[PDB]
Every structure is written in structure tokens, then in C-alpha cells.
Amino acid sequence: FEIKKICCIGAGYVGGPTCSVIAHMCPEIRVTVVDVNESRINAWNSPTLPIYEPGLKEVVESCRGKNLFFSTNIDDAIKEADLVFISVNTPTKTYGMGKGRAADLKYIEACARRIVQNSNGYKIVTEKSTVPVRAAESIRRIFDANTKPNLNLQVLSNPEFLAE
Amino acid sequence: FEIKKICCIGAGYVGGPTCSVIAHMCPEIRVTVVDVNESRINAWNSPTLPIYEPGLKEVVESCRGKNLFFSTNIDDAIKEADLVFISVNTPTKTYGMGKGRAADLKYIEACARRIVQNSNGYKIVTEKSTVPVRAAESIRRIFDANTKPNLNLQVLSNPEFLAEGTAIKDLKNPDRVLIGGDETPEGQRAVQALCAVYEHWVPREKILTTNTWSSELSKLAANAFLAQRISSINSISALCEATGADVEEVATAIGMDQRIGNKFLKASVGFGGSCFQKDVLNLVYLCEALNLPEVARYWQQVIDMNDYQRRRFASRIIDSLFNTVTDKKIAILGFAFKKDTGDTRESSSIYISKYLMDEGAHLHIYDPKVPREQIVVDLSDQVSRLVTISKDPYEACDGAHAVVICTEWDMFKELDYERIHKKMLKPAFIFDGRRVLDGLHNELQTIGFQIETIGKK
Amino acid sequence: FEIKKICCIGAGYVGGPTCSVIAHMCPEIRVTVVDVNESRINAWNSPTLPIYEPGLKEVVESCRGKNLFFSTNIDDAIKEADLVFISVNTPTKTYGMGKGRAADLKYIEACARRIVQNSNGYKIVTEKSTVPVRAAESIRRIFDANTKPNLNLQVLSNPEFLAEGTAIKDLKNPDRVLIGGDETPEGQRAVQALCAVYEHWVPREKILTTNTWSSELSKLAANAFLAQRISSINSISALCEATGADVEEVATAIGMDQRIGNKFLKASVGFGGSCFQKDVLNLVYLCEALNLPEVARYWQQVIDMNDYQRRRFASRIIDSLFNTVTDKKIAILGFAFKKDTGDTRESSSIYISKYLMDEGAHLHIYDPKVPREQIVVDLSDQVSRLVTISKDPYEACDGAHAVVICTEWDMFKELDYERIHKKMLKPAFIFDGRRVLDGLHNELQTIGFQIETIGKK
């Protein structure tokens, strides 16, 4: 089994530069970075990127629209994907248990739900962040409980080590 | 010698049904029940009663108008009466010495004064409540200090043992009737006159008679004993959870020992009701005051356990929703402190709702008897942002992640769980706070629920 | 599968009685009771049994040498047996972790090792104790590690509910029999084999079956519920003394609530016995180990109350004797932890004797069933100077400043107190730490006794 289409939900400091580089290094792979933040997506597609990162602009411009894409169309990106990265943010809870301290997993949970909804057959789903807090476990729970016939979702952890 | 007219001040859970039952068993007696709350009196006379209580409608209609009355005319009823019951609330003090712990006698005290401003000659005056704290003494202190010639008022203590949802049954065959009065020739004649009333439907073997203080301690103590058992079994429910046992099984084996008995061993999200918590608080308070901190310390645990049982239950719900419940829709089935009443005082359902609201949950509450505008009042922006009162249970479980059963309403046992499931977000949790879905366990798993329940795994 | 031979390791207060009743109710089955302690075994084989227990002499003397045997030959009894009871003692650790709290399992362990050494083929091994504290698991650990081909040892749990003093009547008519075994085909077959022993005299609906853990938890919990009831009522006895009430009247009142039951509500100087303190102490210790500190501190109150109640009573004694006993002759009536047994383990009498001895009293101790050598061991040079063991009670109160009734022996109610009052120093005090002298109160005041009693000022 070979990955030929990659989707990444989350075009942040992690999702963006990680996907850009996978694209640079693997020309036969299609890499699609998605995000709900329309503004951040257009900026990725503009001559001014939404984050500053030395040497990033060269990488993006060497494969954007070639094997690297940025888009607000999350649904179709997941649908055609072999691997789905989850590369979203887990803000600190502002009330209740673990307030000021624990991570809020709500955006990971929303990615898992959306993935199940837009998925059939076999896909690999990889949580990729700098602080993974029970992320893979939580993805698995959603997937286990939202079975479809011939949907086979594989859950992996692939933590990101880069420093901004 | 002999009681023919009864007044009852307070038309609440205690005054209302108990006088209703006296009427029914004692046709020769004219019973009048009075309250400042016109709105409550009106309902007592309407075809819809202000409280829900099985058999209560039929008992009231059986003799309202004939020998049973409700009116806002306090003065006239006091005036014509041989016996005046006080059955009023005593809210917890909001300020002063023992703010937030001791009962406030400010309504019981107002009652006694109003009695003297409307009484001449002989009257028997009886304190009657679920939790009596120095109630007889503070009626007496007021009678002693408002002395009119020819006025002879005798003070009796007559604790009410009934449990809401089972009031009529309890009233009609009680395990015992406790009446305390001064051990003077005069107190004895008033005690005996009170006996003679109950003697209409209760065997004399079961009528116990003491002095007034020993009467109140007896009820303080007994209520606490009942609460201790539930806290005790709830402590075991945490142990069972942490080790693979099942508290229902542990309780069967405990209860079959006749020296312990098998009642009051149903583990739960925690006791509520207007009786237990305040009864322990008061007993604690009393012991601190009397220089008995070992005893205070002893009974305080009954409350700490209950608080912790509530908290542990909440925190399991939140855990399962992987510590985030912002905008997640959760159903709350059951708001009363217990089945077969509309009463929410100190209900565990409130407390769960509060811990789930702090997590930002969208709560959808259904209860078949609690008035919608009472749920709203109990949970008080935050309420208007997070709370919906559901009309039926199915719209409460529509779009929901979790179903939380907080009251043991028998109806919950036979909801359409298949239908509820189809429409829940997955994974779909039922948290049975009452062990009410037991044995139904296999069917629910099969359907596709994750069933968490107290004292199992 | 058919049990023909039973061996029981531990010929104590549990094993001797229990095995005798099985022998008596199962005449087809050979019943062998073994022990390392030879004077114990010798006594069981003698006209004078080593423990006192109503009805026991009759039952033994009816089976001994027929199907009931007491031997020191542990190896051969294990070797031939189909079922092997383990019924040995578990003393409190005297050092290391859990010092003074956790039970020491060194004897359970040596039994299981001995059983593997002496066994071949199929045996059922059953742990029977009043307080089982990870017993079954411990046995299993050893059996699992020491295998032999065709050796098949199956472990069950069978907690004993008998109370000393009524052992025979409890074993012949238990409220229930509790038996745990693995949720395995082999476990289930061993469980049946034991039910069938019990089914010779216990009806099937009174026998409960479960896993080993649940069974041990149920026992730990029930024992605890029982001691709570006593601490609970004892706490109300203090409160009664502070406010001028009678705990016997309050207890009567509480007790008639059929949800509380009327049993185990006799206030006392304190519960004793091998069971209760050690049960709660182990329940607490375990809760802490499972990270349940709220459950831990809940149960701890049961013990703390009982320590207070003992103390209150000791110092209440010293206050009535003008704040000093530092040379006075005091009578101790009752050394055993409860009536109708010569057992003294954890007895409240040991604690009152001792406190009074720190304080300079000369004690004269009478019990009708406790050997005098046992009283000397329980108190620990001081014994030399202060303690005297009396032969009858009237010898004990000759010269005395006060009588202190520690144990509810029925003979104490029927003493001629006028004779006693005569030879007692004056004014003559009786401290009734058991309420055995209720109703006789005035009569004794008439004689001029000044009488102090628990739960009554």
C-alpha cells in the first residue's frame, strides 16, 4: 500500500510547513492542506504567507499548485485522501475541570466526526502536533463508535518535532 | 378532654397531606388548613393540587368541603380551634451565628405570636415537621412571654415521619407516631387528647409518647440514621467501581442480615430532599454548640460522602466526553429529588446540572411532574444560554451525546431506547444515576449505548 | 462432584464451631479439624472445650469420634480431604507498612504452602473467616506458582457470619450463606460442591453465589455496617447525656422505623471483638491503597467514635469519684467483649481496666467465663500491684468504692444488691456501661446506690 493523496486538516504552524515539505520531497504525492480559516488559506495561496518562517516561501512556491494545494474544501479533500493528517490546535480550557491547565480536545473531536462523515473504504489517519494529549485515543473512540460498512480507518500518532 | 376542631398553619408537603389524612379517618372532626400563600390555597381547592402525591387527589376530594378546608383566613381558624398544628418551613439562616447551617425559626416564631393574638382559654398547640430544631422550646418561649389571664396553651411535639411520593400510605399506616409533651398533669391531658385523634386509625401499640425534647432528638437522630445508610452504601459504590464489584450485589448480601435490614441500601447519585441534609447540618451544629465535636465530626461525614458521590458522578460524565462538553447536547432525565413527587428541594439533579453547566454543556431537562418554571428557578445569562426544558423525553435525547438519569421515575425503564439511540450522536452514553436500567444492560449494549452506572463497570 | 472428606485448618472460634455444625448436619461426611496448637486440640477432645459457646458441648459430644475429629496431624487431614477449609487468624501487622492497621497474612500463606506440599489430584480449598482481607487472592497466588501434574486446587471464599455467643444458633439458621468462586467452569463446579454441603440444612434461596472478591467485599462492608450502627447509637448516647434524654428511649423511637430496623442499637462502653475494629481498620487501609481517601475517612469515624465513647466513660467514672481513684478498690464486672463467651479479644473491658490503672485504682475483676490467666495477659508489674482476680462478684465488691459493669452478662441483673450495698464503701457507686440495670434504677437509689449509666444523665 502506497499513499498518493495526502490531506491535512489544519494549516497552522504545524500543518502548513509540514505539508509544504512533504510536497517538496515527494513529487508524486498530492498534498492538500485544509482549514476552516478562509483568510489563512487565501494567504497561503498569496505572495504573502500567513506566518513567517525563514525559507518557507521558497518551498511553498516551488510546489504550490503543482503537488501542494491549500483549500477550504475540507469535505472533498478527505474523500479522495489516502492519509488524513489532523494538525489542529487544542486550546487550554477556560472553565470547568482542568481550567487554566488541561487541553480542550473539541477541535480534534470535530475532525474525527467530519472524517467519518466524508469517508469510505480504507484510510490512514495520523494525529500530528507538538503537544499530543490523548489525541489518538480520542480519535479512536469516535471512529470505533461510528462504523460504516467497508470503512476501515487506521489511527496513528506522528508527533511533530520542529521549532518555529 | 376532647378535640373537635383542628387548625393547621402551613399547607406544604407536611401540613397539606397530613391534615387531608386526619379529615379522611376522623369525619367527626373539622380540619382547617391555612397559609399566607393564597395561590397555594387556591390550588388546594382547585381540581389541580399545588403538589404531586399519589392518592392525594382522592383523599382531598373525599372530604374537602365536608370536614376538610383550606383558606387564607388564618385568624378565624386559629380562633375556633381546639388544636393548632404549626407546619411551616424553617429555611437555613442566611446570616448571624451559624449562617448557612442552623435552621431559622423566624416563621415558627411568627406563628406562635399570631396564635396568641387569636386565642382565649384552652388550646393545644403542636409542632409538626420533618426536621425539628428546638421548635417546641421557641414556641414555648413566646407563649411564656405573652401571658393573658385565662389563656392556657399547651405545647406538644409531633414529628412527621412521611416520605414524599409515599405520603398517603405512610400517613395511613405509619410505623409509629411520636408525640412529646411536658410531664405535668396538664401536658399529659394534652398528649392524651392528641393520641385520641390518631387512635382513630393507628393502634395504640404504635403510638409512642415522651417529653418534647426527647421527641425532637428522636427525629433529628432517626433522619440522620436513614441518611447514614445511603451515604454508607454510596461509599461502597465507589469501592465497587474501583475493584470490579457490583454495588447492587454487595447490597443484597449486606441487607439479608436481619440485624441490618434490606431497606435504604439503593446506591444513587446522592440523597436530596428538604429533610436529610438540613437534618445533619443541624445535628452537626447542635453538637458543636454542646461541646461534642467528636459527635459533630462523626455525623458530618454523612454529608461529605453525599457531596463527593455527586461530584464523582459528574466527573465521570465529563471524563467520558473526553473532558470537553462545550456545546455538546446532554439530556437530563429526572429533576425531582426522588420519584413520585414534583419537589426539587436539595435535589441531586440540580447539582449535576450545575457541574455540567460549568463545563458549558447544553442541558435538555425532562421531568414528568416538576413544573418547568421550577427547574429554571433552581438553576439560578448562564441558564438562558445553556438550559432547555423538554416537553417529552425524546426531544431531550435528540442530538444528545449523553442521557443522565437522576431520578428513578419508573417511566424511564420503558422509554424507546432504540429510537433514542438512532438520533443520539455517537458514541452514545447513558449514565444511570439510579440503577434504574439494571438487567436491561444487555439490551442497551446490543443497541449500541455505552452504559455507565453507579457502583458497577 | 461429591465431597466425602472435609479438613479444616484452624480450630478456633470460627473453625471449631463451624465444622462441628457441618459434622452434625452432614452425617455422611467425615469432618477433621486440625491445628498446630496442641492444648487447644486436646481440649476439643476433652470434657472441657477450649472456648465457651452455648450449645457447643452438646453438638460436639454428639459427633466427636463418629464423623468429627480434632487432631494435630495436619498433613494427613489435608492429604485425604476433598474440601479444605482455611480458618486461621490474621493478626495486625506490628511493624512495617500498614503497622497497627493492615492485617498480617503470614498464616494464610503458610496454610496454602502446606496444602500444596501435602496434596495430589483434586481438592477444593475454601477460606472462611470473619474478616477476609485479600485472603482468596493470596491463596491463589501460591497455588498458581506451585503446580504439579494432575494437582488441581480450586479456591473459594466462604466468609463466616456467626457472632460469638450465638454461634450454634447462627450456623444452624443463617440469614444467608455467601460463597464466591471464579467465573470459570472449574470455579462454578467447586461452588456447587460447597452449596450441596450447605444444602443439607440451609435452604437454596438463602445461599448466595458470586466471585471471591465480591464475597470478601460484602463481608468487609456488612461487618462495617454493623459497627457503624453501634458507633452511631453511641454518639447519640453522648448527646443524650448532654441534653437530659435517655438513649434507650431514643433508640426505641429510631428502631421502629422498619427502614432502620431495631437491632444493634444498644449503646455500650464500646464494641470489642476480633471482628469490628480490625474490619474497619482494613477497610480504611484498603481504601487508601485504592486512592479513595473520602471513603477511607468516612469509615474511620466508626472507629474514632468508639474510641471516644470508651474514653468519655473512663473519665466520667473518675469525675464522679471526685477526680481521683489513686488508691480506691474498684470492681470490674465483665471482662469478655460481649456476654455468653470467654473471648476477650479487643474487649472494651481491657481499655477501662487499663485507663483506671494509669490512674491508680485497685481493680477486682470478675467474669463468669474468661479464664484468669487471660485477664493477666491482657493487662501489661502494674498487674502485680493493682490487679486482683475475684472468684465471685460479691467477693469483688467487698471493700469497693464502685462497681463498673463492662459486660452484659445476664447473671449481673440478678444479683442481690442490698447485700452488695452493705459491704461497699459509701456513697456507693454503680457505673452501668451496658444498660443491664434499667428499670431496677429507683430500687437501687432506694438502697442508696448512686447509679451512673451510658446515655442517661
Ligand SMILES: NC(=O)c1ccc[n+]([C@@H]2O[C@H](COP(=O)([O-])OP(=O)(O)OC[C@H]3O[C@@H](n4cnc5c(N)ncnc54)[C@H](O)[C@@H]3O)[C@@H](O)[C@H]2O)c1
Ligand atoms: N493554535 C492555537 O492557538 C493552539 C493553542 C494551544 C495549543 N495548540 C497545540 O499545540 C500545537 C500548535 O499547532 P499549530 O501551531 O500549527 O496551531 P495553529 O492554531 O496555528 O493551527 C491550527 C489550525 O487548525 C485549524 N482548525 C482547527 N480546527 C479545525 C477544524 N475542525 N477543521 C479545520 N481546521 C481546523 C485552525 O483554524 C488553525 O488554523 C498544536 O500542534 C497543538 O498540539 C494550539
Ligand SMILES: NC(=O)c1ccc[n+]([C@@H]2O[C@H](COP(=O)([O-])OP(=O)(O)OC[C@H]3O[C@@H](n4cnc5c(N)ncnc54)[C@H](O)[C@@H]3O)[C@@H](O)[C@H]2O)c1
Ligand atoms: N423553609 C425551607 O426552605 C425548608 C428547607 C428544608 C426543610 N424544611 C423543613 O421541612 C418541614 C416543613 O416542610 P414543608 O415541605 O411542608 O414546608 P413547605 O415549604 O412545602 O410548606 C410551608 C408552608 O408554610 C407556609 N408558611 C410559612 N410561614 C408561615 C406563616 N408564618 N404563616 C402562614 N403560613 C406560613 C408557607 O407559605 C408554605 O406554604 C419542616 O421540618 C421545615 O423546617 C424547610
Ligand SMILES: NC(=O)c1ccc[n+]([C@@H]2O[C@H](COP(=O)([O-])OP(=O)(O)OC[C@H]3O[C@@H](n4cnc5c(N)ncnc54)[C@H](O)[C@@H]3O)[C@@H](O)[C@H]2O)c1
Ligand atoms: N488473629 C486475629 O487476631 C484475627 C482478628 C480478626 C479476624 N481474624 C479473621 O477472622 C477469623 C477469626 O478466627 P478465630 O477467631 O477462629 O481465631 P483463633 O485465634 O481463635 O483461631 C485460629 C486458629 O488457627 C490456628 N492456626 C493458625 N495458623 C495455623 C497454621 N499455620 N496451621 C495450623 N493451624 C493454625 C491457631 O493456632 C488457632 O487455633 C479468622 O478466620 C481470621 O482470618 C483473625
Ligand SMILES: O=c1ccn([C@@H]2O[C@H](COP(=O)(O)OP(=O)(O)O[C@H]3OC[C@@H](O)[C@H](O)[C@H]3O)[C@@H](O)[C@H]2O)c(=O)[nH]1
Ligand atoms: O536556550 C534557550 C532555548 C529556548 N528558549 C526559549 O524557549 C521557547 C521555545 O523555543 P524553541 O526553540 O523550542 O521553539 P518551539 O517552542 O517553536 O519548539 C519547541 O516546541 C515544539 C517542539 O516540537 C520543538 O521540538 C520544541 O523545540 C522560546 O521562547 C525560546 O526563546 C530559551 O529561553 N533559551
Ligand SMILES: O=c1ccn([C@@H]2O[C@H](COP(=O)(O)OP(=O)(O)O[C@H]3OC[C@@H](O)[C@H](O)[C@H]3O)[C@@H](O)[C@H]2O)c(=O)[nH]1
Ligand atoms: O435507598 C435509598 C433511599 C433513599 N434515597 C434518597 O434519599 C432521599 C430521601 O428519600 P426518602 O424516601 O427518605 O424521602 P424524604 O426525604 O421525603 O423522607 C425523609 O425525610 C422525611 C422523613 O420524615 C422521612 O421519614 C424520610 O424518609 C431521596 O433523595 C431518595 O432518592 C436513596 O438514594 N437511596
Ligand SMILES: O=c1ccn([C@@H]2O[C@H](COP(=O)(O)OP(=O)(O)O[C@H]3OC[C@@H](O)[C@H](O)[C@H]3O)[C@@H](O)[C@H]2O)c(=O)[nH]1
Ligand atoms: O447493639 C449492639 C450490638 C453489639 N454490640 C457490641 O458489638 C461487639 C460485636 O458484637 P457481635 O454481636 O457482632 O459479636 P461478634 O464480634 O462475635 O460478631 C461480629 O463479628 C463477626 C461476624 O460474623 C458477626 O456477624 C458480627 O456480628 C460486641 O462488643 C458487642 O457487645 C454493642 O455494643 N451494641
